[PDB]
Symmetry: D2
Subunit: 433 residues, 4 copies
Amino acid sequence: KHLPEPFRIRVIEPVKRTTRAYREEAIIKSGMNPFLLDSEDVFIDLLTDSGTGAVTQSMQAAMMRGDEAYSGSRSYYALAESVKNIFGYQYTIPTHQGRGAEQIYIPVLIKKREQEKGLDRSKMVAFSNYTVRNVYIKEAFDTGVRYDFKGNFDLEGLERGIEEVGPNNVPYIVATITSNSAGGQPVSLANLKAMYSIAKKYDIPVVMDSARFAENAYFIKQREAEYKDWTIEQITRETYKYADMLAMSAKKDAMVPMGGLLCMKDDSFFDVYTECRTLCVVQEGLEGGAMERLAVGLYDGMNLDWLAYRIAQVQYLVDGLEEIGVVCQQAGGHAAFVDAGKLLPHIPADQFPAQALACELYKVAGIRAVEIGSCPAELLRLTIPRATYTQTHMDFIIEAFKHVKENAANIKGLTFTYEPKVLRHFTAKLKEV
Amino acid sequence: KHLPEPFRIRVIEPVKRTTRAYREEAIIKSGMNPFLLDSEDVFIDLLTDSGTGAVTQSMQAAMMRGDEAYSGSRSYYALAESVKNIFGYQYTIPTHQGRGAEQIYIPVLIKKREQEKGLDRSKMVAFSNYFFDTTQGHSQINGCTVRNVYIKEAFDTGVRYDFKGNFDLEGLERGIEEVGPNNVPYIVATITSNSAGGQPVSLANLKAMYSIAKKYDIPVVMDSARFAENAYFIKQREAEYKDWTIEQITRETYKYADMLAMSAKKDAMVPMGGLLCMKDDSFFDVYTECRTLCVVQEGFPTYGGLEGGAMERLAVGLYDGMNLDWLAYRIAQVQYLVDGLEEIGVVCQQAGGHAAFVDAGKLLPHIPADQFPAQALACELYKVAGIRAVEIGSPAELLRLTIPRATYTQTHMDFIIEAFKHVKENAANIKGLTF
Amino acid sequence: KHLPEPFRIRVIEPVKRTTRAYREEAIIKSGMNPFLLDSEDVFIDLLTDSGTGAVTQSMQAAMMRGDEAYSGSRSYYALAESVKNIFGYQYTIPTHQGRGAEQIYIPVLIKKREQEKGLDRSKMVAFSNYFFDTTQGHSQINGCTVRNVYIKEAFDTGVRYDFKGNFDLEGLERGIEEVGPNNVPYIVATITSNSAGGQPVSLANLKAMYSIAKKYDIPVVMDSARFAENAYFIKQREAEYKDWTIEQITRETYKYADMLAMSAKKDAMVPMGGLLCMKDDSFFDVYTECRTLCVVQEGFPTYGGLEGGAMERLAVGLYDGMNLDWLAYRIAQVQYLVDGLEEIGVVCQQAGGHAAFVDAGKLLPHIPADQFPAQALACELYKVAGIRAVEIGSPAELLRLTIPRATYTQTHMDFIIEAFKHVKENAANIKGLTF
Amino acid sequence: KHLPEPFRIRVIEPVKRTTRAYREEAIIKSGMNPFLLDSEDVFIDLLTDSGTGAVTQSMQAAMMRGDEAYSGSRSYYALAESVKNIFGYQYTIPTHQGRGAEQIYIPVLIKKREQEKGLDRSKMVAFSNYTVRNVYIKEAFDTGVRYDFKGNFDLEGLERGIEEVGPNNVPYIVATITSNSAGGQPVSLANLKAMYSIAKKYDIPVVMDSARFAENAYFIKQREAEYKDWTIEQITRETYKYADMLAMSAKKDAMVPMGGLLCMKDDSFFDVYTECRTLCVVQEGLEGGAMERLAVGLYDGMNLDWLAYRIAQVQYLVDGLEEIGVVCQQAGGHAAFVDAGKLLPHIPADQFPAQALACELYKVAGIRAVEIGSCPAELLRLTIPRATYTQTHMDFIIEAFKHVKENAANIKGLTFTYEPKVLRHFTAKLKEV
């Protein structure tokens, strides 16, 4: 069941209404790739939830108070300072997105090692619950074994892959939270701890990748026995003792439209922080009010009632769709991968099911989701933008997904009428087979 | 069936949780009276729909372009500018809210007649298909009393009549000679009408009344707080206009008054502001005098006590507030709540545009009007759910669920029906009160 | 010497240029009266300092955290919350602006005495070291007249006396028996005083008067629109307090009244809002009745017609408005304008906190009060410079340059002195008027 | 003379006041590199004017209307659409700063040529009024020959350097506006035209680099005979016919705190635009309200009265300082390079004059500017943040610069107490000699 929203709506952005008549000129002119579709034509946009969700009034006021100093920025203090209280790292380097924080730490952490341990470039390899090589447990992808912390570190797997390497050629460990395998599964503190030690020994750096830190917190609280009674920050603080440094995209749990963070725990890492400052000068990051905001989203992203709500309703949508037996090739907190061949068995791989599915939803409700499938299987993917849509929204979606599945029969398929050299799915244009 | 929100949500105000215990401490504290309950103790505050719901991005950006000149503010123009298009009136005085309009225009209109028609101070009576607290309080409190001329068919929770709050044209007709037209200083027309639980008025009905008014020639002040919900009802219900747009209907609608006085806190969806406007030169005279008064009361008529940004905003509210889809959603929802409530068997007045009314005593009947059956329901509701409702009373004193725009979802809706359920099945262990 | 602005500028409202020609069309149009000049025709609008100057980032962010509950809004608390700290009063009614406070509190205070002291309706008189338009208009317009008890030394543009707008303690003393203390319903204390051209009042002077008031025991309402500029003057001038902070002085200051009524449009630097407050339980009685009235006039005392965001903002205005540096700059500047004006030889009243006054007739003397020498200066100023000034008059009717906070720079300052120069040397080819 | 501001101030950010007492703990703890100084301690920050100036109320409202679509973003339309009306290019690709737009076009334009003309990588070279090689006229750096359009293209110089190369190894021409040599000098339309033709022939791409497009407009209007009577957009439109594509940092003339732009004129370049979309997917860019804003700053940046004002007062500051004979090693619209050895003759190169100068200003007024000098000469540099400070501000500065020049005698010098491996000036800490 869907929980009632633990807030009041104060500011809304209008969406017009669409006769299926109209919704077709549209998808036609889109040339059947909904990406290439005007929003403002999309009724319910499901294309992604990365900073496309709502904000709190404090977040808004925050944006009014930017001090746009280009140094010693009192705003920057605030941002880095809420980082110290929330995560207790003292080394905040605002980036402007997630992708930011990586483009900076990869090349440094590599070099730190290539030097004081003498790593070998062409035979180097990084590890991760989710080149990296992903060391996740066996339950991981077993939709239909209820394991509570599904994206944990395979401690042993990792152990092995380290010397299988061995220590001098692993620059770091990323520990994504929540883990990003299988539409987003939690990682336990006990596991987090565990894994961290497996690094202390071979002395490797541990980079906590936390776009969904708040959610992961909640799962630990909902589920790890011995925490059931810690608050979200309490959890989160403790959590962060098991990494040296954190790299996040604020556009998720932090609740802001723009923003990235790359930060460091203590001066045992000031050494590194020093070199990212050096690197960051040539590239990447942010408006002063941006910082004031993110400084707040950080605390706002963690309110319990909210996360409970947020996760509630992602859940609710999925329960909603199994109830009408729509196949999901995985379901979690990040996304929802409906399976399209199953929902649409009589349309081949080179006729494209996902696009086709995508367009129908579109015609029928005006939902915009996304062929993520091409070759393993053909998936069409859902995500939900925080504090943006309702249960009625969810209902409309679900229901729309019925009508699809009933006309599953005379819904057609697609064959290229233009396709660019790389990344076909972003601007290709299709027709049926 | 709840309609899905015709909009994405953009900015929310998060709200604290609660302990049943605490809540009790709270209501006990409130004078046993949810009304004086504090904002952060309530979880769904249905106290009133007046300036409490959401605004549009455009609305809010608008609030950053205030021109704050004390006199002849660009913003004042922008607002008059839109009053002309939306309603077609040419004389636009901004007041800070409806009470403003009203403390200004009654006494103005009361002197118009005391002279050119020699009206009798102590024998005077003003008419309306209803009057708000403010309207009659400010008319009782000025010397002149009102009498309502609603239809027989009015609050009858049995028959479902499409325009449930029209003017009784005849009961009005009568009332006019019955008091000597020299002495009706003005007729107020409320749209939608407040005390029907929010019931429509017909264009046709409007026409007809306007005729009687041009007849003894009496000012007609459209009271306009929910002008948009009214217009919608027409579009869905009055035969001729099924095909027009909302402004379109609005516009027609607004031919039948020499002036409008209005609270922008409801339909126009500003947190603050009201309008006092006149239609054409046949009234510039009045405008002139109103303008005079306004200084003294709200301040200079370039602001009538609005800041620049507020004018800017209302100037866009007035638009946004008419958007079709939106009111279809807004109304739907009030509606979906009422249906939700019939099915658990709670007798409530017809779906108006904005609130929902509840037969107090029936849901709990073994309570007599000595101990009050309206209030304890409030208290209870809150006690149990963290809902705040209140009882402004209307035969039978009863319970009102006014409903802030764009603020709560189907789910909040469902959570309220719910509490009425929990409440039903404890009517047995449930008491009465004297505050 | 202009002090440099103690702040970076963050958000500006760009302003249209002008053709001398057009400007003339414009003033001719205005009724020959700059006042009704339109906002975008003016280039430096000195019409009044009331809600027209700048706000702080904090102020403005604040406006995004409104809680908009009709009753018991978190924001209402935040605001009362800061009234307590800043002034130490415990009874905080928000009105939408000073007129509000005043339409509420006069009549309230007028019944206090009509009963417990049996005051005589028709024989009643209220006292003050001055009264604004609104204050006396709302007291003339309520039955009770005022008399001002300013000092001999008051408007004398010759002597420079540090606290130029004190109470004549004795001229007051006298006036009280002279009218029978049963009949003074209240004394209003203005700080700074408006009609001195903005002149300070002394803490000492305040004390002394408060004594006389506790004596015949009469309510003292501090009228508080420029309470901060007042406090500063003291800090720079009253001997004992040279060392304290502004709140510090404020606080002391505010012991000597049983209540304050206030317009936040000036010193507290909100675009909109006013306060009506009482100090301690010795008055909760009053508060109680004021609260009653407010409904009828501004609306429910959790907002007194303010939106949530406005409460939030003023709640931070009240602070920001006392910042030292700021008022040092604010005042400096008014000052630097006056000096600028003496040196081209224009006789103007002492530097008050906020405006600048001008001997009308002197700068142009071969104009007699038949043709008006105040107005044509206005017109001219504007005609020539795109300045708008106005003449609210004060012996001799004269010209006022009130000056919006944080809005115009030294340069704008210089550009105004300038026009007075251009204007001087054309007094020869310059005329008089009858509108 | 300083012109009065053609606006009203509405929103101010507070700055506290500082006893020189206090201003010293400060610069000390800064370790004598003012960069490392808390703003909020700086009275008048002169560190830079890149998006650290003010905005219009329309700019502010604009930021309230972001539609934060992750595609077909109605906001994006607005931004790209004001770009079409202002510059008439149809290919807007918002970046998130100036530096953005380059990191994208360099590598593409190189490749466009390396292929359809067959450029040679190690012997390739780009040209510019200001590797590139700068082809500016002889007057350029002659402080004290009043030439009105000082940063123009040396047509002949360029001519030569092209074949001296020849055409196949010049990927493009950048044409910075205003040109960035010698603290910012204009470029004439006639010159712009001229130069463009010198590319049409060898068919080279012309990339208009326009962080200060509005100012440059004004100079042309103030100065090119035959335009004296065109408006700023009129000028600007015409201007842009002489490039194929434009790369700007909105943080200057566009008047926003965040933002970049990379855009293209017509489909003769759609070809290229296509590949930058490809490249841009892996990296770089912006909040929806950001776009709404910049869409407005674009028009706002151009109001005449304003630019006149803005340039006025930059001028005024300089006239102000020659009047007290402070030596500027160059003066223009971008910055102001005071000469420090001249102002401070009795302090050597390895004792550092600029830092020393920087600190004194600081102690005396609380001005923060910047040693740009190390070896040619030792400069300390000023810039002014738009619509932020006043004339009184300027006066305070100027005057402060007197007191400096009178105690020119017992003002000391500096010698390293820590210096990092690269970019010493950003975090080094100094002491006197």
